């Protein structure tokens with residue numbers, strides 16, 4: 290099924306809310322007249338890869354990729370055989386310098402991280418083909434805020450990775466006495482040298498995980 294049951298159990302209170310029904314209607318109408326990404330079965334891939342209770346790390350994105358075959362419901366990720374986009378190449382580049390033993394998988398599919406409890410959540414979960422931010426402020430933001438809010442209140446010692454000002458705003462209210470928040474610039478080439486290169490978020494995450502008595506992410510398990 291398209292929406293993981295452990296996530297549904299905790300998020301179902303949102304579904305009957307006025308904003309959510311409206312959002313579903315909006316997306317449905319868009320799909321009738323336009324090509325909308327990701328495909329219908331991949332809007333909620335981020336609920337399918339692990340149990341909600343097993344989340345260890347949260348990487349917040351903004352808008353899904355807007356080109357053919359790119360977005361598949363995990364932020365920054367692209368399925369085989371799609372080449373990693375520039376943002377993702379920069380992520381892999383930082384991994385290579387942050388963690389010597391990291392190995393580039395030769396593809397852009399981040400499912401391996403998702404399975405380990407890395408939540409790869411975009412704030413806005415659909416986009417009209419070729420039109421960045423086309424589905425902005427139509428209700429997704431309230432829903433993904435609800436996901437972040439649940440994790441904030443109902444988990445312990447998560448590491449939140451906030452890349453770029455948009456993600457920083459979205460994670461502004463995270464409880465920093467209960468969770469860890471790491472912030473830097475967005476990995477896109479335009480912003481990557483404003484802090485992302487050298488941020489060392491991946492090793493830092495693993496050390497923070499070990500501080501909470503948790504097993505680290507194998508970032509090369511892709």
Ligand SMILES: O=C(O)c1cccc(CNCCCCNCc2cc(=O)[nH]c(=O)[nH]2)c1
Nearest residue numbers: 350351352353354364365376475477479480
């Ligand atoms: O114009 C600017 O000032 C500017 C500069 C640097 C980054 C940004 C933020 N937008 C970059 C948009 C391209 C990434 N797309 C990759 C991506 C994929 C995904 O799934 N989620 C996400 O947030 N991003 C904006």
